[PDB]
Symmetry: C4
Subunit: 467 residues, 4 copies
């Protein structure tokens, strides 16, 4: 039935005068765009404050408890020691700084009760089970774990006997690690200006003096786990914070709107399929009656719904970890803004470029299929050869990202210079390898990617012009 199929394939701008139907579903989609974007913005702006407070407190803790800390971490660990005396100095510094906390800290910070309800410091050792050294070792396979609890009144003793205790004989040739752990209370007092009750915090802090490698270096890790707990005893005049109602009602509105959009899009797909079957049955156009933009909308609505549920759960349980909810909401927003291109396609000057991209994607991917085998071979060869001599080739994922950046011309000279001429064979191989890869990929593969795009544009343009 032509009188209906043409109306279906039309645009909303024309339907308003072919049948004078108002485009309320387009208004629903615009409202969804606005509400999703504003929800994401509010969520990010609220997360920034909590993340900043936790990270700043962690930096202050590193400066307070780590001896000689320079303010920047050494890779995944804060600092390291190489001498038998440096380790003792760092451990005793951490303990002594814990003892004097009230006199040194600039924050609104204090001691917290541990799991045993004691206020104090726990330090643990892990040594091999038996222990002459280096020549006739008796070291057994399994480990012995020893811990001691030091309370504030123990550290206070005029002569801190604990420092002379038998516990601190570290026999570093058997040592696996030493762990220092304690709890601290905190308050995010900066929030007081809102007249809301300020958020308290509890920090679970651990210092790990790690020499699993037994290579003569101890790596020092500082970790802090922060929980909100409860502002249970404070006399700060003002008001409490029950804005959850407001935030929970906006999330409910977002969920409802996304649900409505999903229902309407699925209904549109069902109607299009009924039209397709009617066309198939009517008489002996293309099979693709399904509008592909509807699928993207359905995916985005599902992700937005589940991310909003996750956000409501996190707020209700007063959690402070946002990774999965952030991923869901951000991907939903990304797909929501991509879907705006559907409304630009209703105009001729914009449609040809969209059709050019649609024609471009498959052949570019089929050429990526060929390029990927050369890429894999080069990744394996660079990892196996240059890895022991180059920081950018240490492991396979770093190799892949280095090569991907190198195809785009990034950091090329540093990549060339970063490998020493200590081994002449490896240096010559590195020169051959880098020259071949960079030349082939930049000057041939990327040039064929430009040629394919240009040919797709020419094809689409000549189709649109000639008809």
């Amino acid at each position: 039935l032509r009188e209906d199929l043409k109306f279906y394939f039309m645009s909303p701008c024309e339907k308003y005068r072919a049948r004078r139907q108002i485009p309320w579903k387009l208004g629903l989609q615009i409202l969804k765009i606005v509400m999703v974007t504003t929800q994401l913005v509010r969520f990010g702006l609220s997360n920034q404050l909590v993340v900043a407070f936790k990270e700043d407190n962690t930096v202050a803790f590193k400066h307070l408890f780590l001896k000689g800390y320079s303010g920047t971490d050494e890779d995944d660990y804060s600092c390291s020691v190489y001498t038998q005396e440096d380790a003792y100095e760092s451990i005793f510094f951490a303990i002594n700084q814990y003892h004097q906390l009230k006199d040194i800290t600039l924050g609104t910070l204090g001691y917290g009760e541990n799991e045993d309800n004691r206020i104090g410091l726990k330090v643990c050792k892990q040594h091999y089970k038996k222990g002459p050294s280096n020549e006739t070792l008796n070291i057994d396979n399994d480990v012995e774990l020893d811990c001691v609890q030091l309370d504030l009144q123990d550290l206070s003793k005029k002569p801190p006997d604990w420092k002379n205790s038998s516990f601190f004989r570290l026999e570093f040739y058997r040592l696996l690690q030493v762990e220092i752990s304690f709890h601290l209370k905190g308050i995010d007092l900066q929030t007081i200006h809102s007249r809301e009750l300020p958020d308290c915090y509890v920090f679970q802090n651990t210092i790990i003096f790690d020499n699993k490698a037994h290579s003569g270096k101890i790596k020092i890790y500082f970790d802090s786990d922060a929980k909100i707990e409860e502002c249970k005893d404070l006399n700060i005049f003002g008001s409490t914070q029950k804005n959850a109602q407001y935030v929970l009602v906006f999330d409910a509105f977002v969920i409802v709107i996304c649900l409505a959009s999903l229902i309407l899009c699925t209904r549109s797909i069902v109607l299009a399929l009924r039209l397709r079957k009617r066309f198939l049955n009517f008489f002996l156009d293309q099979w693709e009656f399904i509008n592909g933009w509807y699928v993207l909308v359905i995916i985005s609505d599902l992700m937005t719904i589940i991310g909003s549920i996750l956000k409501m759960e996190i707020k209700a349980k007063n959690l402070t970890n946002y990774d999965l909810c952030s991923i869901f909401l951000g991907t939903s927003t990304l797909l929501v803004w991509v879907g705006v291109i559907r409304y630009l396609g209703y105009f001729q000057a914009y449609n040809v470029l969209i059709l050019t991209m649609q024609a471009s994607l498959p052949k570019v991917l089929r050429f990526c299929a060929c390029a990927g085998m050369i890429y894999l071979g080069y990744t394996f060869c660079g990892w196996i050869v240059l890895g022991p001599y180059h920081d950018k080739f240490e492991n396979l994922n770093t190799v892949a990202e280095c090569l991907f950046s190198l195809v785009n011309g990034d950091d090329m000279f540093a990549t060339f210079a970063q490998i020493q001429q200590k081994s002449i064979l490896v240096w010559l191989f590195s020169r051959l390898y880098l020259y071949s890869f960079i030349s082939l990929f930049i000057y041939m593969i990327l040039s064929l990617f430009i040629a394919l795009i240009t040919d797709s544009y020419d094809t689409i343009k000549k189709f649109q012009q000639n008809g």
Copy 2:
């Protein structure tokens, strides 16, 4: 009337022999180019000296008054302290260095009178209004502000009692900030070689010990506000500086020339419109009789006039802030040099490229319209996800600039490496995100931008060749 319309559409090189009219307006435009460029050059060369003197004095002040200053700022603040004793040491160092200024400074520098006409040092505290700590805080919402004035004869007292005063109990758990402020006189003695009277300066200096965050770190800000004031009592033999007459007369000349150019361009536009109406009335060419280069000239003349007025005002009032005047004059100069292309268009070999750019701009912008939605979605998603884990994604504008640089291949490997694998989910998402964005934008969008430019060139060239 063809005998006039053709003459109007012609070029000045041909009018000199079709009607032997001399091209005095082109000479006026060339003179305007020369005078605007030389005014901008003189202005910048004069600004460099004042800016350099102020900034060098600020660096010397930071070295003089900030304890342990390394010579480079920590982001927007000069330095920071994390310990209760470091803050006291920094504050007392600032005060003591102020006391000893005459014995430490290498410059031609001295004490200045404050608003109260006293010579001395003012330091202020800002604490919460009530103050047990951390467990039962009585902290009220509003702040109490306390200040003390320390004169030179007070700091001189053999035993500097001020250091033992009750004022310096900082109760850091209530502390918002401590501010130290003072005035210094200075002389730009380097100018003496000109036999002009040297420019004196007054520096208003403030040191802010800031812990609004209450995160256990105090940020230390140093700020200096410099005013010229007057060289009211000096015996340096030589001559005074009244070159203002010279500078004010050149600015008047520039204003007059730009006014004449604006009047002539508006007259040309009026005459072109009269020609257009005469053509419309004559008989049953294109509607665009208005030369678009005239609009750019009018805009540039308006900006030059207002910027010259601003410059004259700044010099007359002896100010030292140049932002708005610099913007106006620089944009005027930029548009003036762009307008030289109009004179290259009078030659065939150059005209085709100008026409190619004119044909290129609209379709490139209409493709930018489609690309911008993908760009916005990626910006929001990267901000929400990678922001807590990546310095380049902390806030939305940084995200946008990072993505824009990334499309152009800049700093790609560092962008890949800058995000820790502490959270595996976020790391995998970052890899997917970066690969998708870089691949799509570099290998498809930029390739369609090259294809559009090439097609525009082919169209213009075949039009010019075939006729």
Copy 3:
């Protein structure tokens, strides 16, 4: 004979139904891909541990024995001294740190016997043969070498007389170098968790205090040579490591499979040549009956075989140097993964891109022939001129890599800024040189490389479409 030639030129997917022959050789090639890749992965993963242990021990040694070592090397040497007293302090620090090793080290480390079977420290001097200074030098051409052996019981003497010995008069104006050498035993105790017997190590350590240049700086080199030796006396309960059988049997399997693949590929080439001669003799197609992918397979199989033999030799002799074997195996793997493209060529959509690359390569190389002469001239000129004033132009290979990176837009602004304006002539020449090179190569040569690729794509595509 057409009935056979067509079958020969066919694809394996079609032969399974034209003659129902199973493609067992393709299965052999897939098995070879899998086994080669897994062998390379296991080899790299095993090498990482040994390399990491050796390098970490070297870093710990540098921190232990080098005075004031900052944790990062100064180019090819660890550190340097410029003062007559700094050198003495560094030498005596190295000796004293050797004396106290058991009390300072964090690792499972101990003293090793030297070649003379003594446990101790050897230090050697190299001075000119004769020695007034600077005005009337009597310095002869040849050198005098003097060494002393210091045992542990000598260093222990309450008053370390050795420090006052006549040996340590270094007369630095005649000094070539001072060398300190010693042996250390070590254990890779981290491996104990496998219940395998841990790998012991012997480190041969040398410290070179080098002033061959006589330019007033002594360069300090630290080198460590590690050998496995034998875990001959240890009481660590567990099991020994005879997994060699497993690793040796997988290498034997890889060798056998590569040998079979090589034999089959050579047989296929022989059969193709017989077909070619039969075609030549039959009647008065192209001469290239040889499938070029077979040659790559043969090369890869030869490299894999020899690399596996090298790996087996290294493991049997318990060596720890992997450069040549890594090169052979990695290049073999790279060529193996490149050869997968042969299987993509059996599909039309992929074949056209392969043919485009094949058509592109020769003309791109013939244009590289012209570009290389300009490249060589610029390399020589930049080396001769900018070398004394620019770190990126010091020597010819650095010049070539800098120019290659510069063509790809890398580090351009730093390259411009890195040359001082101390000599105005050289600065102007550097500006002219850099602008000319960058402009010519980026905006003309790379543009002709894009044009050649596009023309090759157009030719291949129109051939495939039109037939």
Copy 4:
């Protein structure tokens, strides 16, 4: 006369069989290439050693005489001081280190006689002519210069009175600079292994304590001027160095060969012009009978001749400055290697690319003419606006190089991030400016440069194919 003109226009490969003439001039050109390249290589390799020795001695001097020198210069000066006491400490450190030189230096170094034939240290002061401070200055325009000579026996006095002398009252508010100057003898003893007599050196060293700016910072400059002088009294057994004969005879050979090549090329040009006039007179081809490669050869020969003369002069007068000779020889070598393309043009597959480049250059330059005006406007605007707030825009040449690097995508994100948001107006303007410039130049101008190159290639290829 066709029988001669065709032979003239031919190639040497064909002349060997059309007339069997041997191509001895091509052999002369090949010999010239070889000899010029080897002369340049020997020259650079010999210069490297002298430059390295001088620079290493300068670094050792900076470490010896500059207090607290970190091993890296602060821009154009080695180090700086901001305090009245730091300057005194640095000056007295320099003098005391000079006094103790024999006990601290690691090199073959000693004291040199000054112009007055004394061995000692000269230090000079420059103050304003009159000198209350800051309030009523009596400072006159002109300067007073005061110097004192300190000999070794003066510095030796048990109590170094000189340190208490009235000379060292620096009245820093009048101070322009303090200069310390001395001479040192040196020997390049590393050359002794050649059995040649070693090269002695004399270093003229000056330390400038500079505060011309009077901004509260003193900049400390160290400069060293090295001359060879004569190895007039040394007992080092071996042989002298008279290899000059060898080097002077190779330079004479190069001069002779370049002269012969120049004469032959000019003769060829004269013969071509006679052919052109004969063609013009014969009958009523193109006017360009002159082979353009001959002009390049003549220029290269002239530059090689004059550079060889300069090199011979420098060696004869025993100078150590090579800038102008290096420029001449390097440019000669660059043009010599570019001229090899003439021999590639004798082959069809290479000729089309050369013709493509020749056709490309003019239209690319005519588009550069249009692009340069936009470039100039942006340079002026960025200098005037962003200069006070951005290190990359401080002065016009830095602006131009920054923009040129920015067009090529280098350092884009750092350029965006390097400007503070202290002034919001300037920050917004910087964003607008950077986005507009980068977008316009990368996505439009560079795309038209690619289109012009492709169109030139298509034109040349279709001309060569169709005929």
